[PDB]
Amino acid sequence: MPREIITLQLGQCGNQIGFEFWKQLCAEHGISPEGIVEEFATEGTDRKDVFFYQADDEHYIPRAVLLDLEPRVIHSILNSPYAKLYNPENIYLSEHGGGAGNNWASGFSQGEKIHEDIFDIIDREADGSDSLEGFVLCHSIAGGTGSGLGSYLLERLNDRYPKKLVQTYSVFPNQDEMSDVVVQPYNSLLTLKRLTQNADCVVVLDNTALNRIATDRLHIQNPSFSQINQLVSTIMSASTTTLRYPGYMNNDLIGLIASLIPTPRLHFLMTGYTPLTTDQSVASVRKTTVLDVMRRLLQPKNVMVSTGRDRQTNHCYIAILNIIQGEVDPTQVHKSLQRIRERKLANFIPWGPASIQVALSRKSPYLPSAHRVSGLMMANHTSISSLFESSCQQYDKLRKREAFLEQFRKEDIFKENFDELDRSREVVQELIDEYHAATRPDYI
Amino acid sequence: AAAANLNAVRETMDVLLEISRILNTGLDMETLSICVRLCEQGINPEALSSVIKELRKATEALKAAEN
Amino acid sequence: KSPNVLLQNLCCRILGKSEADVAQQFQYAVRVIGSNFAPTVERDEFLVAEKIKKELTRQRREADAALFSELHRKLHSQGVLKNKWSILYLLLSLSEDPR
Q: What is the dihedral of CA A199, A203, A204, A210, to 10 degrees?
A: -150
Asked if A412 and B3 come within 8 Å (Cβ–Cβ), the reply is yes
Asked if C39 and B41 come within 8 Å (Cβ–Cβ), the reply is no
Instruction: Yes or no: say if A200 and A113 are a contact pair by the CB < 8 Å rule.
Output: no
Name the residue of chain C whose CA is nearest to B60's CA. Answer: C15
Query: In terms of Cα–Cα distance, which of A19, A21, A50, A54 is closest to A35?
Result: A54
Rounded Cα distance between A20 and A16, Å, is: 6
**Listed resolution, Å:** 6.8
Instruction: Yes or no: say if C39 and C86 are a contact pair by the CB < 8 Å rule.
Output: yes
Q: Any bridge partners for residue A273, and if so which?
A: A376
Q: Which helix (H) or strand (E) holds A5?
A: strand A5-9
Backbone breaks in chain C after residues (C–N over 2.5 Å): none
Query: What residues in B contact A412, CB-CB < 8 Å?
Result: 1, 3-4
Asked if C77 and B11 come within 8 Å (Cβ–Cβ), the reply is yes
Asked if C2 and B38 come within 8 Å (Cβ–Cβ), the reply is yes
Asked if C75 and B15 come within 8 Å (Cβ–Cβ), the reply is yes
CA distance B19 to chain A (A): 21
CB atoms within 10 A of CB A333: 20
Rg (CA), chain C: 17
Coil, strand or helix at A309:
coil
Contact call for B and A: 3+ CB–CB distances under 8 Å: yes
- Phi first, then psi, for residue A166 (nearest 5°) are -110, 95
Query: What residues in B contact C88, CB-CB < 8 Å?
Result: 45
Query: In terms of Cα–Cα distance, which of A409, A347, A410 is closest to A379?
Result: A347
Q: Which helix (H) or strand (E) holds A319?
A: strand A317-326
Rounded Cα distance between A306 and A159, Å, is: 30
Q: Which helix (H) or strand (E) holds A65?
A: strand A64-68
Name which of A412, A413, A414 to mutate to probe chain B: the one with the most chain B Cβ atoms within 10 A of its Cβ: A412
CA A183 to chain centre: 23
* Cα distances (angstroms) measured from residue B59 to each of B33, C4, C84: 21, 20, 28
Instruction: Yes or no: say if A15 and A66 are a contact pair by the CB < 8 Å rule.
Output: yes
- Chain B: residues touching C (Cβ < 8 Å): 5, 8-9, 11-12, 15-16, 18-20, 22-27, 31, 34-36, 38-56, 58-59, 62-63
B59 touching chain A per CB within 8 A: no
Rounded Cα distance between A370 and A280, Å, is: 10
Name the residue of chain B whose CA is nearest to A106's CA. Answer: B4
Rounded Cα distance between A113 and A36, Å, is: 34
Query: What residues in B contact C19, CB-CB < 8 Å?
Result: 55
Rounded Cα distance between A119 and A371, Å, is: 40
Query: What residues in C contact B4, CB-CB < 8 Å?
Result: none
Q: Nearest-5° angle of CA A336, CA A337, CA A342?
A: 95
Rounded Cα distance between A359 and A341, Å, is: 16
Name the residue of chain B whose CA is nearest to C57's CA. Answer: B23
Pairing of strands A5-9, A201-204: unpaired
A412 touching chain B per CB within 8 A: yes
The alpha carbon dihedral of A127, A129, A133, A134 has a sign of negative
* Cα distances (angstroms) measured from residue A142 to each of A12, A274, A420: 11, 26, 14
Rounded Cα distance between C68 and C71, Å, is: 5
Q: What is the dihedral of CA A306, A17, A404, C79, to 10 degrees?
A: -170
B2 touching chain A per CB within 8 A: no
Of B22, B46, B56, the CB nearest to C68: B22
Instruction: Yes or no: say if A409 and A415 are a contact pair by the CB < 8 Å rule.
Output: yes
Instruction: Yes or no: say if A202 and A168 are a contact pair by the CB < 8 Å rule.
Output: yes
Instruction: Yes or no: say if A441 and A382 are a contact pair by the CB < 8 Å rule.
Output: no
Rounded Cα distance between A171 and A65, Å, is: 18
Size of interface A-B (CB pairs under 8 A): 6
CB atoms within 10 A of CB A33: 18
Show which subunits contact B, needing at least 3 CB pairs below 8 angstroms. Answer: A, C
Name the residue of chain B whose CA is nearest to A416's CA. Answer: B3
Asked if C93 and B46 come within 8 Å (Cβ–Cβ), the reply is yes
Give, as one character, the DSSP assignment of residue C36: -
Rounded Cα distance between A293 and C63, Å, is: 68
Instruction: Yes or no: say if A310 and A387 are a contact pair by the CB < 8 Å rule.
Output: no
Pairing of strands A201-204, A92-93: unpaired
> What are the E-state strand segments in A120-209?
134-140, 165-171, 201-204
* Cα distances (angstroms) measured from residue A128 to each of A9, A17, A50, A147, C89: 18, 22, 12, 27, 61
Name the residue of chain C whose CA is nearest to B7's CA. Answer: C78
Show which subunits contact C, needing at least 3 CB pairs below 8 angstroms. Answer: B
Q: What is the dihedral of CA A28, A134, A155, A200, to 10 degrees?
A: -90
CA distance C46 to chain B (A): 15
Q: Any bridge partners for residue A60, and if so which?
A: A54
Rounded Cα distance between A84 and A57, Å, is: 9
Size of interface B-C (CB pairs under 8 A): 139
Contacts of A51 (CB under 8 A, 6+ apart): A2, A4, A5, A25, A29, A60, A62, A240, A243, A244
Q: Which helix (H) or strand (E) holds C19?
A: none
CA A123 to chain centre: 21
